[PDB]
Amino acid sequence: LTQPASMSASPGQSVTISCSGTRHIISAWFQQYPGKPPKLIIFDDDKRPSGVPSRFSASRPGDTASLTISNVQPEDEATYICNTYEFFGGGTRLTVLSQPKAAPSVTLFPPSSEELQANKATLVCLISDFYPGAVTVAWKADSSPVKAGVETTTPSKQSNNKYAASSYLSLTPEQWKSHRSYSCQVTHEGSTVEKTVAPT
Amino acid sequence: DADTTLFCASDAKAHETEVHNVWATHACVPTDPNPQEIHLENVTENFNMWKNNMVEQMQEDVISLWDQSLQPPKISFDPIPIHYCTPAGYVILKCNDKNFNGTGPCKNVSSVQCTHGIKPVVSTQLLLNGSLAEEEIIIRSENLTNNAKTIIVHLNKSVEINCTRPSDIRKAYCEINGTKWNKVLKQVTEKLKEHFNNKTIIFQPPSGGDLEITMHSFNCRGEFFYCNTTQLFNNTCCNGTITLPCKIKQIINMWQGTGQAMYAPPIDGKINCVSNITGILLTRDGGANNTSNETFRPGGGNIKDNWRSELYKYKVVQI
Amino acid sequence: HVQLVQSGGGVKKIGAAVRISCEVTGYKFMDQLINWVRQAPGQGLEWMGWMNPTYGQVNYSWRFEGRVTMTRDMDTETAFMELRGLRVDDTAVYYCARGPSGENYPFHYWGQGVRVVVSSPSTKGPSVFPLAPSSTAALGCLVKDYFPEPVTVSWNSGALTSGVHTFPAVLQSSGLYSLSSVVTVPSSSLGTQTYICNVNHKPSNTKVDKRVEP
Ligand SMILES: *[C@@H]1O[C@H](CO)[C@@H](O)[C@H](O)[C@H]1NC(C)=O
Ligand SMILES: *[C@@H]1O[C@H](CO)[C@@H](O)[C@H](O)[C@H]1NC(C)=O
Ligand SMILES: *[C@@H]1O[C@H](CO)[C@@H](O)[C@H](O)[C@H]1NC(C)=O
Ligand SMILES: *[C@@H]1O[C@H](CO)[C@@H](O)[C@H](O)[C@H]1NC(C)=O
Ligand SMILES: *[C@@H]1O[C@H](CO)[C@@H](O)[C@H](O)[C@H]1NC(C)=O
Ligand SMILES: *[C@@H]1O[C@H](CO)[C@@H](O)[C@H](O)[C@H]1NC(C)=O
Ligand SMILES: *[C@@H]1O[C@H](CO)[C@@H](O)[C@H](O)[C@H]1NC(C)=O
Ligand SMILES: *[C@@H]1O[C@H](CO)[C@@H](O)[C@H](O)[C@H]1NC(C)=O
Ligand SMILES: *[C@@H]1O[C@H](CO)[C@@H](O)[C@H](O)[C@H]1NC(C)=O
Ligand SMILES: *[C@@H]1O[C@H](CO)[C@@H](O)[C@H](O)[C@H]1NC(C)=O
Ligand SMILES: *[C@@H]1O[C@H](CO)[C@@H](O)[C@H](O)[C@H]1NC(C)=O
Ligand code: NA
């Protein structure tokens, strides 16, 4: 039911993905690669089919199933999905640290005067150079949130294997000029970086 | 705690060219007026009808019955009851825990080396001419959590159904008493609310598929009836008698699975069948964890489930 | 070995309808219900429904009833899924699946997934807008509401390589692509010379470019 969006692990360490919710309806685990369909790696909570190594284990002692990986290796960089019956989790994008350390560089751009001239508005958040490629975006008016007319692109690799993405907030010019400021926050591994603009 | 092959018994006579009587006189042994029940030493045993092996046996027997008898070649037949007895060292056990759902323990475990009177009637959506439920209505499934697994409903009030073709060449109607059906459907709705943590229940016609599972399909007088059953699952409730539009078909995707059949038009004259709606075959709509409702549509699973409904207590074991 | 193949996807406009196939190889097709599941881009798996290949008993989710239908073909030994009146959010990768011999769940065997992209029926055409620096300094161009991909953008008639960065397009709710390309400049060259991007959109072929001024 509920899964964390992403995790992070150095090679050789041990990690644990936790899927809560469950409702005690057994558990099964899929590992999925970009483009490839999901591949079952754990079935009946604590059992694994042929071909799955010993690093993978799992246990569902209640409504919170968990998948443990020991001594992570390059196969493991994938998306891990809990499932009960026809219900799947949102996926956990486990990423092994190939190049250590990173920090998202973010830039915020206000709507254009020509766009306001065309009674439209579009604010642009532009994130680049972060690792692992898993961030969350947040659009805020003044101090309250907005959850309408927002389109955020999925992260994609650059030429240096550091990810980048962008987010677009379309908006009526009346609402654009009816607020003091507008803020884009991006969260990347706990740390959140803010950008603020104002109608001037 | 094993599974073996068994033979059958029949209360049929080989003097009339029936397709069940002549079949069962040589395929089965005449009934043996020797019933010995032994209420066991208050032992509690766990049953599991969903992994029973006698249902496969009965499936083979009905397949052979139909294949041997029916040809595209016309004669009236009727579903005579079939018994199933077993040799020595291989014995059948029976559960009598009043309201048993067919997968748990039982306390008054009886023991008889043969079954009870069971007629092999094939039907979709609704189980006909069955055995009533003793105290309450029973919900049976491997577990209701799984949508793929079928759901069988044991009714403790047999509802009357009356399908009739008059002397307008293949049309027919099937009359039911609407009040009784609405009452029993409300009882099943209450019991599913109980089984689903006081969840709202909705009844709807099937989402789609062939006519055999979309409509109530059976066979009477040697003629294949398909009945439009949207009126019974009218979730709004209607209080008067309900007439069900039905039609006799001569293409049939054979109930075992082999193509599309071809048969002569029905014999001239009136065709009547009064029978006993005794069970209900249901499938719960999957998904929708957050939603406060549970939608159910009739018909589903193999024909094996029809036999498994009647074989929900018996179990073959070693001696 | 069992295997399931699917090859009926692609790109369709809004409204419309899509037919998706899945062919099985290594088991009795009459048994083993077939599941239709969907994964949105950068999202989680979503199970639409399942279908019985015996007589065609189907079971859809509550979010697709009336929209999705499932059918079968026995000699083909294949299954079909029809999704009509599609929406932009229906852009996703689509899978057929099945589990063990013991009925349905969990899904031991998957297909391969086909991409289905719901896009605009028209061609529309871009609208390049400027993103001027306010007050560490960078500027950029913004192409919005165009179709179909791609759009090639450079600055000052292909005269800059370092500092430029073009990010992939996004498919908005209206069904029109949009991206933006930005370049970082030392906070001394502004006012010295102008700056103009170069938007080229062959499908409509409007090489319209404008300037950036605060
Ligand atoms: C147990 O089964 C026997 C067999 O018919 C029956 O006589 C008895 O009443 C049953 N006991 C209960 C408590 O239902
Ligand atoms: C059937 O009964 C057994 C034991 O009484 C119980 O464990 C199981 O959950 C029941 N299942 C249904 C569908 O009623
Ligand atoms: C039938 O079962 C229902 C509920 O399952 C119960 O309320 C009713 O009393 C039963 N009726 C008879 C005649 O056993
Ligand atoms: C059916 O599902 C339940 C979920 O609560 C789980 O205990 C098990 O998988 C099954 N239980 C029974 C009694 O069949
Ligand atoms: C139908 O049910 C009634 C009581 O509900 C019973 O008396 C009658 O024998 C049944 N007919 C059958 C099973 O053919
Ligand atoms: C069934 O319907 C026919 C035609 O309406 C009627 O003649 C017959 O008496 C009915 N049978 C019963 C048992 O009501
Ligand atoms: C309705 O639901 C509540 C809790 O969900 C339960 O305690 C109550 O018994 C239900 N009502 C009936 C009539 O069973
Ligand atoms: C049954 O009849 C109703 C109303 O006439 C209609 O849904 C349709 O004709 C039939 N439905 C089927 C065959 O699923
Ligand atoms: C259900 O019955 C009521 C009449 O009491 C009415 O809405 C209509 O006849 C039926 N609706 C259906 C069959 O959809
Ligand atoms: C339905 O049965 C009731 C008694 O159970 C009786 O009034 C009559 O036989 C039927 N009612 C109608 C309206 O047909
Ligand atoms: C149920 O039994 C009666 C009496 O033997 C018979 O007339 C009727 O045809 C049977 N039902 C079916 C569906 O064959
Ligand atoms: Na094979």
Number of CB atoms found within 10 A of residue B100's CB: 21
For B317, phi then psi, to 5°, come to -145, 170
CA A145 to chain centre: 19
How much distance in Å is there from the Cα of C168 to the middle of ligand 11?
69
Is the CB of residue C111 less than 8 Å from the CB of residue C96? yes
Q: Taking CB atoms and an 8 Å limit, are C61 and B286 in contact across chains? A: yes
The CATH number of whichever domain residue C74 belongs to comes to: 2.60.40.10
B165: left (phi over 0), alpha (psi -120 to 50) or beta: beta
What's the burial of A166, exposed, middle or buried (CB within 10 Å: 0-12/13-18/19+)?
Answer: buried
The two tokens of residue C166 are 């073009």
Name the amino acid, one letter, at B6: L
For B51, phi then psi, to 5°, come to -110, 25
The set of residues, in sequence order, having a beta carbon less than 8 Å from that of C133 and lying 6+ positions away, is: C139, C185, C187, C190, C214
CA–CA separation, C95 vs B285, rounded Å? 20
The two tokens of residue B314 are 């018996």
Domain boundary among C119, C137, C172: C119
In a domain, C212, yes or no: no
> Closest to A91 (Cβ–Cβ): which among C44, C110, C167?
C44
Residues of A in contact with C182 (CB under 8 A): 107, 126
CA–CA separation, A44 vs A51, rounded Å? 16
Q: Is B225 helix (H, G, I), strand (E, B) or coil?
A: strand
The set of residues, in sequence order, having a beta carbon less than 8 Å from that of B114 and lying 6+ positions away, is: B9, B32, B83, B84, B85, B86, B92
DSSP string, B206-221: -----HHHHTEEEEET
Residues of C in contact with B206 (CB under 8 A): 57
Please list the residues that pair with B133 across neighbouring strands: none
Q: How many Å lie between the alpha carbon of B288 and the closest alpha carbon of chain A?
A: 9
Q: How many CB pairs under 8 A join B and C?
A: 60
CA–CA separation, A91 vs A148, rounded Å? 24
Q: How many Å lie between the alpha carbon of C37 and the closest alpha carbon of chain B?
A: 12
CA–CA separation, C52 vs C70, rounded Å? 9
Interchain CB contact of C110 with B (< 8 Å): no
How much distance in Å is there from the Cα of B310 to the middle of ligand 9?
33
What's the burial of B46, exposed, middle or buried (CB within 10 Å: 0-12/13-18/19+)?
Answer: exposed
Domain boundary among C119, C153, C188: C119
CA–CA separation, A31 vs A83, rounded Å? 11
CA–CA separation, A133 vs B206, rounded Å? 45
Q: Is B111 in the pocket of ligand 1 (CB under 6 A)?
A: no
Domains of chain A: 6-96 (2.60.40.10), 105-197 (2.60.40.10)
Sheet holding B82-85, edge to edge: B28-30, B7-10, B82-85
Resolution of this deposited model, Å? 3.2
Nearest ligand, CA C24: 12
CA–CA separation, B299 vs B127, rounded Å? 10
> Closest to A126 (Cβ–Cβ): which among C35, C46, C180?
C180
- Report the number of distinct structural domains present in chain C: 2
CA–CA separation, B33 vs B283, rounded Å? 41
List residues, by chain if needed, whose CB lies under 5 Å from ion ligand 12: C 1, 26
Index of the ligand 9 atom closest to the CA of residue B236: 1
Is the CB of residue B244 less than 8 Å from the CB of residue B234? no
User: Do C66 and C153 fall into the same domain?
Assistant: no
Q: Taking CB atoms and an 8 Å limit, are B289 and A1 in contact across chains? A: yes
Closest CA to B51 of C28, A85, C103, C32: C103
Closest CA to B81 of B158, B157, B20, B149: B20
Q: Is B110 in the pocket of ligand 1 (CB under 6 A)?
A: yes
- The boundaries of the domain holding residue C183 are 128-204
The two tokens of residue C11 are 């790109």
The two tokens of residue B170 are 């293949």
CA–CA separation, B8 vs A164, rounded Å? 73
Radius of gyration of chain A (CA): 20
Is the CB of residue C151 less than 8 Å from the CB of residue C143? yes
CA B308 to chain centre: 8
Radius of gyration of chain C (CA): 24
For A80, phi then psi, to 5°, come to -110, 130
DSSP string, chain C: ---EE----EEEESEEEEEEEEEE-SS-TTSS-EEEEEE-TTS-EEEEEEE-TTT--EEE-TTTBTTEEEEEETTTTEEEEEEEEE-GGG-EEEEEEE--SSSS-S--EE---EEEEEE-SS------EEE------EEEEEEEEE-SS--EEEETTTT--SSEEEPPPEE-TTS-EEEEEEEE--TTSBTTB--BEEEE-TTT------B---
Is the CB of residue A165 less than 8 Å from the CB of residue C167? yes
Closest CA to C176 of C142, C149, C198, C152: C149
B129-135 CB contacts, 8 Å cutoff, 24+ apart: B129/B79, B129/B275, B129/B276, B129/B278, B130/B158, B130/B276, B130/B278, B130/B279, B130/B309, B130/B310, B131/B278, B131/B310, B132/B156, B132/B157, B132/B158, B132/B278, B133/B99, B134/B98, B134/B99, B135/B98, B135/B99
CA–CA separation, A68 vs A16, rounded Å? 4
User: Do C34 and C136 fall into the same domain?
Assistant: no
Is the CB of residue C123 less than 8 Å from the CB of residue C178? no
Number of CB atoms found within 10 A of residue B66's CB: 17
Q: Is B94 helix (H, G, I), strand (E, B) or coil?
A: strand
What's the burial of B194, exposed, middle or buried (CB within 10 Å: 0-12/13-18/19+)?
Answer: exposed
Interface-testing mutation among B141, B142, B289, with chain A (most A C-beta atoms within 10 A): B289
> Closest to C42 (Cβ–Cβ): which among A86, A115, A154?
A154
Residue with tokens 């968990």: A66
Q: Which residues of chain B approach chain C closer than 8 Å at the C-beta?
A: 146-149, 206-210, 212-213, 253, 257, 283, 285-288, 291, 295, 297, 299-300, 302
The two tokens of residue C27 are 């088991």
CA–CA separation, B206 vs B297, rounded Å? 5
Length of chain B: 319
User: Do C113 and C142 fall into the same domain?
Assistant: no
Q: How many Å lie between the alpha carbon of A127 and the closest alpha carbon of chain C?
A: 10
Nearest ligand, CA C27: 12
Number of CB atoms found within 10 A of residue C151's CB: 23
Which CA distances in Å does B176 have to B131, B158, B164?
Answer: 19, 12, 11
CA–CA separation, C180 vs A168, rounded Å? 10
Number of CB atoms found within 10 A of residue C59's CB: 27
In a domain, C210, yes or no: no
Number of CB atoms found within 10 A of residue A175's CB: 13
CA–CA separation, A151 vs A158, rounded Å? 20
A99: left (phi over 0), alpha (psi -120 to 50) or beta: beta
Is the CB of residue B26 less than 8 Å from the CB of residue B14? yes
Is the CB of residue C19 less than 8 Å from the CB of residue C33? no
Is the CB of residue B125 less than 8 Å from the CB of residue B229? yes
Residues of B in contact with C58 (CB under 8 A): 207-209
Q: Where are the beta strands (DSSP E) in chain B?
A: 7-10, 28-30, 45-46, 82-85, 90-94, 105-106, 110-111, 126-128, 138-140, 151-165, 171-176, 200-203, 216-220, 223-227, 242-249, 271-284, 293-298, 315-318
Is the CB of residue B6 less than 8 Å from the CB of residue B316? yes
Interchain CB contact of A49 with C (< 8 Å): yes
Residue of minimum CA distance from atom 13 in ligand 1: B97
Q: Is B253 helix (H, G, I), strand (E, B) or coil?
A: coil
Q: Which residues of C81-112 are buried (b: 16+ CB within 10 A; e: fewer)?
A: bebeebebebbbbbbbbbbeeeebbbbbbbbb
CA A84 to chain centre: 22
Residue spans of the domains in chain B: they are 7-318
Number of CB atoms found within 10 A of residue C172's CB: 19
For A116, phi then psi, to 5°, come to -60, -35
The set of residues, in sequence order, having a beta carbon less than 8 Å from that of B197 and lying 6+ positions away, is: none
Interchain CB contact of C47 with B (< 8 Å): yes
Kindly give the pairing relationship between strand B200-203 and strand B293-298.
Answer: parallel
The dihedral built from the CA positions of residue C100, C104, C106 and C109, taken in this order, carries a sign that is positive
How much distance in Å is there from the Cα of B155 to the middle of ligand 5?
12
Q: How many Å lie between the alpha carbon of A159 and the closest alpha carbon of chain B?
A: 41
Experimental method: X-ray
Name the amino acid, one letter, at A44: D
Neighbours of chain B (3+ CB pairs under 8 A): A, C
Index of the ligand 2 atom closest to the CA of residue B142: 13
Index of the ligand 1 atom closest to the CA of residue B108: 1
Q: Is B197 helix (H, G, I), strand (E, B) or coil?
A: coil
Name the amino acid, one letter, at A33: Y
In a domain, C213, yes or no: no
> Closest to A153 (Cβ–Cβ): which among C112, C170, C173?
C170
Domain boundary among C119, C141, C175: C119
In a domain, C94, yes or no: yes
CA–CA separation, C37 vs C68, rounded Å? 12
CA–CA separation, C142 vs B170, rounded Å? 69
Pocket-forming residues, ligand 7, beta carbon under 6 Å: B 194, 197-198
CA–CA separation, A80 vs A6, rounded Å? 9
Q: How many CB pairs under 8 A join A and C?
A: 94
Q: Where are the beta strands (DSSP E) in A103-160?
A: 105-109, 121-130, 136-141, 144-145, 150-152, 156-157
A96: left (phi over 0), alpha (psi -120 to 50) or beta: beta
In a domain, C214, yes or no: no
User: Do C98 and C160 fall into the same domain?
Assistant: no
The two tokens of residue B235 are 């979730």
Nearest ligand, CA B42: 1
For C5, phi then psi, to 5°, come to -120, 145
The two tokens of residue B36 are 């010995």
CA–CA separation, C78 vs C22, rounded Å? 6
Closest CA to A192 of A142, A92, A113, A125: A125
The two tokens of residue B191 are 């019991």
Q: Where are the beta strands (DSSP E) in B208-319?
A: 216-220, 223-227, 242-249, 271-284, 293-298, 315-318
Give chain B's end-to-end CA distance (angstroms, integer): 9
User: Do C107 and C15 fall into the same domain?
Assistant: yes
User: Do C138 and C114 fall into the same domain?
Assistant: no
Residues of C in contact with B253 (CB under 8 A): 55
Please list the residues that pair with A140 across neighbouring strands: A145, A183
B7-318 fold? HIV Envelope Protein Gp120; Chain G (2.170.40)
CA–CA separation, C177 vs C11, rounded Å? 14
| Helix, strand, coil percent values for chain B (each to nearest 5) | 15, 30, 50
Radius of gyration of chain B (CA): 20
